[model samples]
Each structure stands twice: as C-alpha cells, then as structure tokens.
Target: DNQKALEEQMNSINSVNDKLNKGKGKLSLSMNGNQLKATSSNAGYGISYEDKNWGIFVNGEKVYTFNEKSTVGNISNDINKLNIKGMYIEIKQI
Candidate 1:
C-alpha cells in the first residue's frame, strides 16, 4: 500500500515499484519556441508531475494539467517532438 510511500519525500520514498517505474516512461512536451522563452510577453510555463489532472514542473511552474491516464501527446500535438528531463512516478496497488 502507498500508506508507507506517502510518508516519504521524493528522495526518501523507498518504493521499489516507483524506482523501477522511473526512466521507463517519459512525458514529452513541446510549446511554441516563443512560449518557452523567457520573454516578458511569453512568460513560459513550468513543469511538474502530479495526480488528479496534474501538470509537469520544469522549474517552478505548471506546464499543463492533464488527466492521469493522458500521455504527453494529450497536452501537446506531438509527444515525440518535445524533450523532457525527468519524471516522478508513484506506483501503488489499488
């Protein structure tokens, strides 16, 4: 159960399922070059991985809030076109 996993933070969570699931999946994202740039008008979004229709956090911002079952393609037109560095996967037996 996640009862134990829920108690630890990102670095300390010792769930084998979670560690094993890492790197196996990736969330690809792509936005207009202007949108991702650090321009006053663009004000690009951040990345974060959350549940309940959460988004991926790149720095400290929310990229997009999509359904859990949704893929990187769901938020963007082409999932394979974008580049992502990390993913925080939580595994549990529900």
Candidate 2:
C-alpha cells in the first residue's frame, strides 16, 4: 500500500512538472523536508508535510489537508485550477 501511494505521488509530481515546463513555470523540491512547491505567474501551488499530515496550498494560502489516503491527483487538480498570469512566481527557500 505504501509503495502504491508513493508511486501515485511521484506520478502526480511528474504531471505537475510536465505542466509547469510546458507553461514556462517552475517547480522546486525542498531539501529540508517532505515538501514541493511550484509557481506560474502570480499563482502558486505547495505541498508539505506538517503536523503529521500533508497540506496543500494555493497562492500561499492553506487550502487542503490529507493523509495517505489522499491522491496526488487532487493536488494536481488544485494547481490546474489556478489561472496563472505573470512573468514568474518567485519562491524563497524557507
């Protein structure tokens, strides 16, 4: 089960990566913890492990929280919902 979940998470990350690359956006994986962030224009998408749970963010705002049962597809969906516009979305390492 954990292996399946990990694969799904990786697939979702790849999906987002592909989208970002095509859109001239950027994706960053944190070296500190279980976190990934992406940006396009003024829009942003973030995922992180916090408080023993996984959290999702849109534009720096916390939008959703999930555990192992949550599919990364939901994360992709949230990112896809953003109508990104701008030159770039700057992400400062924290």
Candidate 3:
C-alpha cells in the first residue's frame, strides 16, 4: 500500500517536472514562515475553486473544512507535516 502511494506521489511530481522541462508551467509549494502555500503555473484560482481544488493537510488532518474556503495564507501552527490533496495542477503558484 505504501509503495503504491509512493509511486503515485512520484508520478505527480514527475508530471510537474516533465512539463517544466518542456518550458511549460508547473506546480509549486513552499513554506512562508509557518504557512504552506501552493500554486499552479497553469491554473488560476477560480479554476481551483471550481474544478481543480487543493487542500492542505497537517499531521493527516485538513486545516480547512470547506473546499471553497481553501486558499493561501493559512495558519500553520503546530503542524508536524504538510501534504496537498486533490487537483494536481491548480493554483496561483507563488
């Protein structure tokens, strides 16, 4: 199970990497102070809000309850780890 999950994660990252190598946009996620921000060089925020959505998970739990409310500048207090779920390529990548 873990292997499959790891492979899937690899595929996701690989897809992002492949596009960047082709001079196309890619996805990005980084820490700003305590907050983890994500952005997609391809999709805009409205597309993210409508079809391709992203969520921040901290220590296996999601920080935001509602999908529509998920956005950048979220509080990262007491977060042990961070991961993103859903909509692989959607964001404002900054």
Candidate 4:
C-alpha cells in the first residue's frame, strides 16, 4: 500500500533535515546507483526512486529513500536542498 508510504519516505528526508537545521550545515542528496535504498526507526516503509537518493542517520541508525521518474524514478528523487518541499526531514544542532 502506498498509503503512509509517502510520509515514511519523507521521514527519511526529515531525518537528514534534523541534521541540517542544527546550523549552517551541508546536506546533499546524491545517487548514482539504480536502487536508492533507505530505512527509518519511526517505521520501515521501504521507498524507491530514480533521481532522489537519500541517506539519513537518525539516533545512530541509517535511513534511506529516493525518487524515480517511472515507477523507477518517482518524485522522491527531488528531495534535495533546492528541491526540498514536501520532504519529512528536520534538523537542529545541539
């Protein structure tokens, strides 16, 4: 079910955001492989994409997600700093 799938995918993004919002940090989303994989502590809603490749490490664990164009490259591929809109990433340095 693609139900909360989008949200779960977003969580991966937010986990990275959680690191950027801390201060003037640089969080880049880059992918050169065919399968962009990610996991999250909140939930394991495996997300796949083409263009968007994510890698977020939250609370010690690593979460990943991305966006492809055609079932292979969905919208999740646009979760970059310039293309960050509906992503679920949140950051704040301590």
Q: What is the C-alpha lDDT profile of model 3 across 60-85, one tens digit per residue?
A: 44543223223222322222234443
- Per-residue lDDT of model 1, residues 1-94, tens digit only: 5633422233312333233223323422222321221111112222233433534333233333445334333344332234532224232322
Candidate 1, after superposition: displacement of residue 46 in Å? 23
- RMSD to native for every prediction? 14.2, 15.3, 9.9, 15.7
Task: Give Cα-based local distance difference scores for all models.
Answer: 0.32, 0.36, 0.34, 0.32
* 60-89 per-residue lDDT for model 2 (tens digits): 544444442233344434644454222212
Model 1 bad stretches (over 4 Å): 1-51, 78-94
Order of candidate numbers by lDDT, starting with the best: 2, 3, 4, 1
lDDT of 4 by residue, 10-88 (tens): 4544444443223221223332221223221212122332243334333333333432222212223332222223333
lDDT value, candidate 1, whole model? 0.32
- Candidate 3: lDDT of 25? 30
Q: On a 0 to 100 scale, what is the lDDT of residue 27 in model 4?
A: 26
Report the candidate with higher lDDT, 2 versus 3.
2
